[PDB]
Subunit: 192 residues, 4 copies
Amino acid sequence: ARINPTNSALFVCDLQEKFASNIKYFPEIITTSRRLIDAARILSIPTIVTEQYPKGLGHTVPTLKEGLAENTPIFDKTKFSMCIPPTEDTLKKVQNVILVGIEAHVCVLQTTYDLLERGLNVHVVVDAVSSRSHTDRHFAFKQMEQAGAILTTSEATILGLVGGSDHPKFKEVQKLILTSAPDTGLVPLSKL
Amino acid sequence: ARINPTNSALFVCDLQEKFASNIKYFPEIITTSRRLIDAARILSIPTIVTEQYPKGLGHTVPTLKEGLAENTPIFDKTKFSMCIPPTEDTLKKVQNVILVGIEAHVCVLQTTYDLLERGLNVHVVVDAVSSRSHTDRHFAFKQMEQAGAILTTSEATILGLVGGSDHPKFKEVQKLILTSAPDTGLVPLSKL
Amino acid sequence: ARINPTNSALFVCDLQEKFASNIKYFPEIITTSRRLIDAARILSIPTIVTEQYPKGLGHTVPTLKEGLAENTPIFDKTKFSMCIPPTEDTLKKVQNVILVGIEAHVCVLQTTYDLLERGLNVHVVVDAVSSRSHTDRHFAFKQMEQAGAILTTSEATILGLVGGSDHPKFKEVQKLILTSAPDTGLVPLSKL
Amino acid sequence: ARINPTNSALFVCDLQEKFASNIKYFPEIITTSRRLIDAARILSIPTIVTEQYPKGLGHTVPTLKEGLAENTPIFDKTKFSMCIPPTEDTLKKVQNVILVGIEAHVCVLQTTYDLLERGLNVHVVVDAVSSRSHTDRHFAFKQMEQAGAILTTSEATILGLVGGSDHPKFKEVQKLILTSAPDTGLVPLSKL
């Protein structure tokens, strides 16, 4: 599974502001999710944003909306998976889904399962995906891996999409990754 | 393997009183196993409970018993695996087994092996499964995933079973997960 | 792969005296390797022991020799893999090899590759296998896992062989695991 | 996948001067990469070196060039993968690639994928591979192994190539591994 700007879509899973206080490393996950949003906008990659029950949970964080392409749709849902009817038009035109968003073990995991069933490759951006619980997040990644999803990072994805430093949009995406993505406790303390 | 209340069974492995002093995170595992017992009762999911040598090892912890459906069967065994004659008819009806309890590397692991041989999918609830030794538990999970068992968490499992906030039993199961399941030392301390 | 006393052999890899100063958790690995030596003797499981360059690295630690049955051969070698001509006949009569010993990333790993090629299932006893370096040991397990070897522990293996407390040899092998196996730093320290 | 000096090539990717201050464990990785370069020269294993945009990033670190086998090609590139036309003839002669170098999640990962696509076995030397970010490096290895790359270590590789202590070049390669390769924090802390 080799991602490029013409065979991939970005899915933004339920990144709503009323979650903030519960989600682990939420500020970092917003920062890094915005990088992927910008990258998708620069690389003309179709972006889908969902919102879980926005009547109670509010809408997508403003900063993320501000990076979205002019015609990016935002679909509301009560089903955990992002694979709802109005997303299928986008899904027919791509072979890869890049996934960011929250409750890795719920909406991100169920989405991942649905996309894999449909024969799509799923690229989970671990530094842009989190849960209320560290354990739920930790094992969400394992379940996604077991099922065949690629566990990747923001900088790996962004540079993987352009393939080389000669890419027409390399300088634009390089600006987004000038500083390393903020740490989200993914790397264990080292044994001496 | 997509779990729902109609294609799954809950298996409760040997969570007995005399194990309290020896099993790592025993109190936590009891709390979290009870959540899964409750979810199964709510969603009409058949529950099987076993006990190993109940005369020596005690009976199932009261907190767990108190959550069981009116006619949930409790079977005693000497075999490590829960796949014993009295459980065979339950297994014939289901495609998935949700697994909690102890002897992670013994009874839980051997149960897992036996179920996979029978063609069942196994969903090991890591935050509800433990051992006397941290090392035994850690590599039990690795052995299960190697064998093809799914390493999942209680909250992932509960919400996975309902699939969305419009499920008629969503509000009932939502009570079970109001607070995150207690930590059982599954996530490594991270470095900067 | 389901291990039992009639389908398995124990392979003891190069647990020699001069490694004592240059192996992480050497005393712990000897203690635990002796447990598997004991279990194999009790259960009539054929045991094969090797020695690499005994003139320059010393002989098998006395504790381990004392646990071997009256027969049990000790083969010297210069090749890293324990798969030398004298071991070929034992391998033909079994489907599983339980593996303990040192140079996880060298002698243990190469033995593992050779055995899997011969069509044998390999069960690596992680709490009885080590290296001079933590990194070499850590990724040795990952390499073994990748090739299809099972990463197991001493108690999991010993109890896995008997399958229940009604087994005629249960109480005899239970003696070997009354106390948990020594801790060889294999579990990540966890975040609060 | 059984590496020997006659079926293998060493790929050194983008270990250049301007990366020195922007790569975790750069000095360690250079020391360890030099061990593999020396081993390849000793064992007459074909070595290939790439440099990414050497106009801006400078050239291969002097110490590494000092050890290179006599007729070693060094190719420049802007594409992240080492799999460029000039490397094709080398790759048609081998079944195994040993990989060291930097942007674990960029050059090394992209090279790894390209190599695996060509039906080559990839041996990733984890103690000679790193990134600017720990998280990027950590998941680089995960993505590599998901794709089928072997995560190995320098000492495992050197000794794996010779097969035994009676190899005509064993004493020569043994000098390179007299001390353990410098630690790069790859093993999870288990005890403070």
